[PDB]
Scaffold this active site. Sequence first.
Site, PDB file in Angstrom:
ATOM      1  N   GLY A 177       1.165  -1.269   0.216  1.00 20.58           N
ATOM      2  CA  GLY A 177      -0.025  -0.396  -0.112  1.00 20.58           C
ATOM      3  C   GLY A 177       0.767   1.337   0.038  1.00 20.58           C
ATOM      4  O   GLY A 177       2.426   1.259   0.233  1.00 20.58           O
ATOM      5  N   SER A 220      -3.989   0.508  -1.562  1.00 20.81           N
ATOM      6  CA  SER A 220      -3.053  -0.221  -0.405  1.00 20.81           C
ATOM      7  C   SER A 220      -4.040  -1.794  -0.465  1.00 20.81           C
ATOM      8  O   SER A 220      -4.698  -1.595  -1.065  1.00 20.81           O
ATOM      9  N   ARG A 221      -2.862  -2.637  -0.525  1.00 20.82           N
ATOM     10  CA  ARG A 221      -2.448  -3.744  -1.143  1.00 20.82           C
ATOM     11  C   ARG A 221      -2.981  -5.119  -0.223  1.00 20.82           C
ATOM     12  O   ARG A 221      -3.225  -6.265  -0.674  1.00 20.82           O
ATOM     13  N   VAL A 222      -3.428  -4.572   0.192  1.00 18.47           N
ATOM     14  CA  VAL A 222      -4.038  -5.397   1.863  1.00 18.47           C
ATOM     15  C   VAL A 222      -5.327  -4.401   2.809  1.00 18.47           C
ATOM     16  O   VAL A 222      -5.362  -4.968   3.867  1.00 18.47           O
TER      17      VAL A 222
END
Lengths: 120, 303, 303, 236, 265, 48
Positions: free
Chosen positions: C146, C170-172
């Site tokens: 993110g 935001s990658r999670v």
Amino acid sequence: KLQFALPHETLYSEVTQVNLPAKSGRIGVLANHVPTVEQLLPGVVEVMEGSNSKKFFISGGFATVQPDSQLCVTAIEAPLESFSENIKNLLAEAKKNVSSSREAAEAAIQVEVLENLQSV
Amino acid sequence: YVAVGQKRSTVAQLVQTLEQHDAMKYSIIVAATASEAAPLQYLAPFTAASIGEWFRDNGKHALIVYDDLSKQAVAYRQLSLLLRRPPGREAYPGDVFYLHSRLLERAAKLSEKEGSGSLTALPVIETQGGDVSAYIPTNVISITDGQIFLEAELFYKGIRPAINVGLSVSRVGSAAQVKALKQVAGSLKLFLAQYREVAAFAQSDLDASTKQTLVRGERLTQLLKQNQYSPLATEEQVPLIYAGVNGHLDGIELSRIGEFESSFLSYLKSNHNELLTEIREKGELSKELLASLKSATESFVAT
Amino acid sequence: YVAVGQKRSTVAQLVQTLEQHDAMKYSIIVAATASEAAPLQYLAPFTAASIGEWFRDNGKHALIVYDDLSKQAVAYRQLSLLLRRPPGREAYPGDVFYLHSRLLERAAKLSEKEGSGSLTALPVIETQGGDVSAYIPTNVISITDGQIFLEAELFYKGIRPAINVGLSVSRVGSAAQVKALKQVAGSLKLFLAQYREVAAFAQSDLDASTKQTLVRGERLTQLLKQNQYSPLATEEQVPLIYAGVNGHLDGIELSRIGEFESSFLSYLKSNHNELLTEIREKGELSKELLASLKSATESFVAT
Amino acid sequence: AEYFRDEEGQDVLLFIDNIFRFTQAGSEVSALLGRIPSAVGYQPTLATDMGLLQERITTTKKGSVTSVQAVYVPADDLTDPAPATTFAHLDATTVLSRGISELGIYPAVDPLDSKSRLLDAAVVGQEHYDVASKVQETLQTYKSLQDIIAILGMDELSEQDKLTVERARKIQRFLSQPFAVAEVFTGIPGKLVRLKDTVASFKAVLEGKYDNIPEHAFYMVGGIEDVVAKAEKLAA
Amino acid sequence: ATLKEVEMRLKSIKNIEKITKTMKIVASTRLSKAEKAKISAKKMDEAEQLFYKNAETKNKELIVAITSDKGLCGSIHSQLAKAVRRHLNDQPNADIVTIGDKIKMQLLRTHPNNIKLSINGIGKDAPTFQESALIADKLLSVMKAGTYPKISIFYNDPVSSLSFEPSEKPIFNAKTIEQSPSFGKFEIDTDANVPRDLFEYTLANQMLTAMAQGYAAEISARRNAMDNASKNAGDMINRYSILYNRTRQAVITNELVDIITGASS
Amino acid sequence: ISYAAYLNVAAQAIRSTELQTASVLNRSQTDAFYTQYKNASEPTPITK
């Protein structure tokens, strides 16, 4: 009101007496007049607003008294004095050459304008 | 004149030219030529400076033209790298700044207690494609008080001397300007300023104001041409500039600007050498003198 | 709060700010000011993370904000150069990736077996005039999951906070997100990447559909803005997003949006804070809660 | 400076000339010391040297030094490490411009490029902030407005638009304050306009109270009190 | 290399900025004259319209369209094209008279069999009565315009100095003039074919005005377009400048690194 | 010849000397060549 107009110049925007030469001879309009449509012939035109009188040489056009008393005059170009001797001389020469030469119609105009100019 | 790294053939021509203009009767040419060793080249401006110091110390004035410190820089680089001294930006030694700064700080206008004496200096720096960001140019630009920036386009466009007014500045400027010439050149500055801005408008129907500017600007630029290797006296600079300032040259055709100059000067020499002598000796032009000057210009302009 | 490479004065303002908001009592401040020696700065994030790990290894939830790891890079660069280890890409040493990665990966949501540990990590990177391509930023980007890129243009153009939504990912993120804030957040990221597209071609997109989106988008942007150092409650954020998403914010003229927000919130609490308490605990909206909110939102919007 | 602050408890003001030349001098010393020059040739110790210099400049309990430094950007490349390092330390920036000075303004300060990081609302007072924000907004709108107003004509200036123009052109002149050192130099008696009266001046022009006093009757005069006098002189 | 290819591209962008700036200014210069003409012309037209109104006149089909040969003056060409297609829904096929190259090309593509007459087009100078008159005269003779009981002219009315709306009007046939209801309140002749004269006269009078309006809209559009161009060019200056500056720094760093690598040995 | 063409020729004749201005003369200039069309197919763009 009196609209006296050219494409690039509006000379007047009712004006008391106007005397106009039309394909109907000459007509003078003073105040109310019946709402005419008249083709203006190549002309010497006088416009009087009050007692003051202004003299115009007019290329012909259309004249239309409106029923709301607006004298719509539309013409391609006009003052008399600006148009007014050497110019007449030149016009005579050009008339002659064209006389010999659509070229016929052109010559007819050349004679007509030359006479109308000759009048002044 | 400090000829740095220049081939001996070039300097021979320079010397010969100086002899032609009989200028060796005040010139000294310190020569460190291309052939001359890089240590000699390194110490050469410093060495030259000492010659100048003697004059300055004697209270006299002199002008030392270091041409070109760019080749001096390269030589210091050669020495430093070979002495294995730490390299730096653009592979020039780090204290190249210190050296150049020291050199240009030996030029001064002394206090009257010290004698008043001066060593005027005018270093010449060669820009590698106008790269003023280049390390040796940037450094020098900081040290120097003023720059004159010659412009290649102007040179090609046959404007000799090719000086781009925009990129030439003097920060001492009018403090050291002849009072007469100062009076008659505030206008000149303003006119040229407009001409630069209105330059691009040269490419259909153009405003009368712009067209007036253009006539003035083009004529002025033409006026500011000078055939190189022929200098011209200031007392003859001021009449010509006065004309331009008064816009009397606006009418004169571009081709006739050149003719105008010499002719006007000749006219002044016959007609108004009182004015010329007054300009020369007074060095300041009174309202009456500027009045008379306008009259003379008008008369010449008529012919 | 790890303060690395910051003026000791600035840190003192920060401390005072925190003690003004009486937040100090739950927080630690570690300091490695600009004055403090470069090796001290180098070891400064690592040391801070150890303290954080003690909390993490208490199972306790925590957060550590490393301001600024970009200054850790400069410090490590200094150290590396002074260790005469060869400069890496962009002159930042070759182990700079390793440095950041070892630091960053010491933050973790430990498994329930191993303690349920948490230690959230926010590391603050100072981009040199943006442009995320740049060795230090890219190295960090790769480690982190993110990004919250902030846009200078938007900051200047008065969006405080200036959260670029093109370059914030935001990658999670969605796993963390509360169900209330999943439901109300009806692909708002998509919607404002329809606003982003719409305004791309607006200066064409004269389509009423695009205009409707533009009207929503511009107005939605107004909702995003928040007066810094006055943060809104989570419960309160749920209705605001409901309003805008469900397009009841077109019912508010753009100028009066700020008024709408406060008034809307005051209205809701007075009308029924019962709803707000319910979503506070439930953290989900039932069909009834959703309807109640729709109805209530329609009520304030109308008024 | 530190002797004054610490051991005489006074405020000081420390001018530095080019801190670009602080960098330049430092870069050489690193290279001379043989240290590997970091990116763009600047010191490997670039940050720390600025850090030492610029953390002795502070407000101690005793006194406070304040430092005005001169920054000569290297080719205007803000992105270069040396300006960046400087800007990190800087708290405010005063951006004088000669174009502005050429608009007859002494001081020469370019108002839209004048910025402080302690231009913060709380710090300067909320009232002061609101006044400042309005004057900034006024000037900002005015500047942009003049761009197309000049081209389009002043006939395009609406009642709303000319309200701003009238106030703005009056403000622009109001900025022009002759000051004591250059009392001789401009030839116009100096003015030292204190902060309270600064707030007052802008409050009134914003409230258009003195918007009825000519534009050049705010030219080259100090505070609110001063332009009462100037109004009298304009009439006289 | 990067630096130089950036730099040359940036110089190009600079030159483009300069040209679009220059053009925008010259466009403004031209625009003032254009507006001046349009007033006087419009006044003249209004006097004729006074007849048509008071007369309460109101009219294959003819299409006449007006553009300049000149391009780079907004979307005049294609907004007009769009509106032509709209009135070529009204009657599918029509005789297209194209006055000006820009509409000629676009329209020629959309309907190619419909193109019957075209005009090389009015030059740099704003439309003049003489030009209008000849175009009208050829329209009567060649195209026998009155035969088409629908006549429609399309042009661009310069709605505001920042807008242009392509606009059309219907030319009233001589047959129409005859049967106009308040024809009876305009009378004095019947031995003069005043419908046949007035029709011709207003064929031109209307046409000149339309052309003048159009030409002005074009010059206005050109000003607008060249302004917007300058803005777009500015954006590229800034973006490529940032690249230039970064690229400059990068060269210094890479070159320096090479020197250091050598020194290390 | 058409009525307004008749008037046009008259206007041109009125533009016939030194007793008058340039703008008239400019209005008495002709550029365009009416591009005759057919079918697509183009009969020659004869001068106006």
